[PDB]
Amino acid sequence: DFSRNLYDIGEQLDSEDLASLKFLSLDYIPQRKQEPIKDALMLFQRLQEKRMLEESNLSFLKELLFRINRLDLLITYLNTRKEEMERELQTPGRAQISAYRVMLYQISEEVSRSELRSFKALLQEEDSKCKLDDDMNLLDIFIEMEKRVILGEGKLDILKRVCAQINKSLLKIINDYEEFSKE
Amino acid sequence: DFSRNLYDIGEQLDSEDLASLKFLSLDYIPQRKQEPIKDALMLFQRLQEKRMLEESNLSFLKELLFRINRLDLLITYLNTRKEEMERELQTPGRAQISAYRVMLYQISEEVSRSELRSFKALLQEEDSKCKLDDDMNLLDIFIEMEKRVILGEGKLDILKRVCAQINKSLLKIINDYEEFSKE
């Protein structure tokens, strides 16, 4: 039932969904170690092996599905409403995905086609060590930036200098994240 | 095109942007003439009537947008890069906003939440004439301080005594400004 439900969820997740889920699972599953993962079930099983997903522990799966906005799957297969996930995640300490990862992913959510192209151009202005192609989405760019150690939890300078020239909303996402690190 | 472009810039400016722009326009537009201004387009038209903004004169608008860090709008609607604005504004005599106003605004840029609360507490220690609430941002506090004539171009004592107890960076902004009024 449980395994069958996990797999069931996996059948409804597409390639974009998978890419997003793997990006959001970076605090626990290293990016190197993600490219054997070819579908959502493999990701789920990798999470199972890390005891971050089991019959009595569905929290991380729910958080993942909520973050990538698959509310339909939450309802259908996990009988969980968005209101519940909101109440749960806003409570300090319950979120298992770091605020940094969520911040980057939300930026990726807000950026359009043309804004993505602008991001690439502006980044190519700001840095030359990043290897960029035009099939890359924003997440891939983030991964490349981290690979080049110009992006990290406490290094947002280039990210902000780029985003400020694209849309104030992105910069506000960063600024908000940056200031609830008051901790 | 030009008017329609002005409105276009105006749509992207939020309440925070408006407040900042009105603060930075204080050398030309008196504070009591700013509260009929309900949006950015009204500010732009007020500038037009002072012939500080027209089709052949976009410098002040550019300086304003640059100062409040709307580089995205400069690029999108004014085809102007950060590099150009920096080169232009470092040039002696080119800036139309007084160094005093820019100094105060930069202080407002650097101050966080808790630093703002500290600012209010420390100012209430330093003075009893200022009427302060918890909805006031730092700009509003500056306006109140000027209204009470404890803050001005040649009166920074209270400002410095407060800022020294919050963060050395702020005090450095003040000191730098204060001594490049050497001439």
**3-class SS letters over chain B:** CHHHHHHHHHHHCCHHHHHHHHHHCCCCCCHHHCCCCCCHHHHHHHHHHCCCCECCECHHHHHHHHHCCCHHHHHHHHCCCHHHHHHHHHCCCCCCCCHHHHHHHHHHHHCCHHHHHHHHHHHHHHCCCCCCCCCCCHHHHHHHHHHCCCCECCECHHHHHHHCCCCHHHHHHHHHHHHCCCC
Kindly state whether residues A4 and A14 are assigned to the same domain.
Answer: yes
Q: Resolution of the experimental model in angstroms, please?
A: 2.2
- One-letter amino acid at A181 equals S
Domain count for chain A: 2
d(CA B149, CA A138): 51
Kindly state whether residues A85 and A137 are assigned to the same domain.
Answer: no
d(CA A167, CA B155): 37
What secondary structure letter does DSSP report for A32?
G
Q: Which residue of B has its CA nearest to A161?
A: B71
Select from B68, B63, B72 the least CA-distant residue to A165: B72
Kindly state whether residues B90 and B147 are assigned to the same domain.
Answer: no
When scoring B72, B80, B111, B116 by the number of chain A Cβ atoms within 10 A, the one with the most, hence best to mutate, is B72
Q: Is B12 near chain A, with CB under 8 Å?
A: yes
Of B71, B112, B114, the CB nearest to A164: B71
Q: Which residues of chain B make contact with A173, given a CB cutoff of 8 A?
A: none
Q: Is B75 near chain A, with CB under 8 Å?
A: yes
Q: Could you tell me how far CA A114 lies from the centroid of its own chain?
A: 21
Side-chain-side CA neighbours of A88 within 13 Å: the count stands at 15
A57: closest CA of chain B, how far (Å): 37
Kindly state whether residues B108 and B82 are assigned to the same domain.
Answer: no
Instruction: Retrieve residue A18's tokens.
Output: 């998978």
Last residue of a domain, one of B96, B115, B146: B96
Kindly state whether residues B84 and B109 are assigned to the same domain.
Answer: no
Of A168, A179, A182, the CB nearest to B70: A168
CB contact under 8 A, B72 and A166: yes
Last residue of a domain, one of B40, B68, B96: B96
Of A164, A166, A179, the CB nearest to B113: A179
CB contact under 8 A, B69 and A164: yes
What secondary structure letter does DSSP report for A33?
G
Kindly state whether residues A86 and A162 are assigned to the same domain.
Answer: no
Kindly state whether residues A103 and A90 are assigned to the same domain.
Answer: no
Kindly state whether residues B84 and B124 are assigned to the same domain.
Answer: no
Instruction: Retrieve residue A118's tokens.
Output: 């602008």
* A86-100: b (≥16 Cβ within 10 Å) or e: eeebeeeeebebeeb
CB contact under 8 A, A167 and B72: yes
A110: closest CA of chain B, how far (Å): 15
Q: Which helix (H) or strand (E) holds A144?
A: helix A138-147
- What CATH code is carried by the domain that includes residue A12? 1.10.533.10
CB contact under 8 A, A165 and B72: yes
The A residues from 143 to 182 touching B (CB cutoff 8 Å) are 164-168, 171, 179, 182
A162: closest CA of chain B, how far (Å): 10
Kindly state whether residues A116 and A92 are assigned to the same domain.
Answer: no
d(CA A174, CA A169): 9
Last residue of a domain, one of B74, B96, B118: B96
What secondary structure letter does DSSP report for A34?
G
Instruction: Retrieve residue B20's tokens.
Output: 């900042």
Write out the residue range of the structural domain in which residue B53 sits.
Answer: 1-96
| % helix, strand, coil for chain A, step of 5 | 65, 0, 35
Q: Is B16 near chain A, with CB under 8 Å?
A: no
Cβ-Cβ contacts under 8 Å between A and B: the total is 19
Kindly state whether residues B5 and B90 are assigned to the same domain.
Answer: yes
When scoring A118, A125, A165 by the number of chain B Cβ atoms within 10 A, the one with the most, hence best to mutate, is A165
Kindly state whether residues B60 and B103 are assigned to the same domain.
Answer: no
Q: A23 with A139: CB under 8 angstroms?
A: yes
A65: closest CA of chain B, how far (Å): 32
Q: Is B118 near chain A, with CB under 8 Å?
A: no
Side-chain-side CA neighbours of A70 within 13 Å: the count stands at 23
d(CA A23, CA B41): 42
Kindly state whether residues A135 and A104 are assigned to the same domain.
Answer: yes
Q: Is B117 near chain A, with CB under 8 Å?
A: no
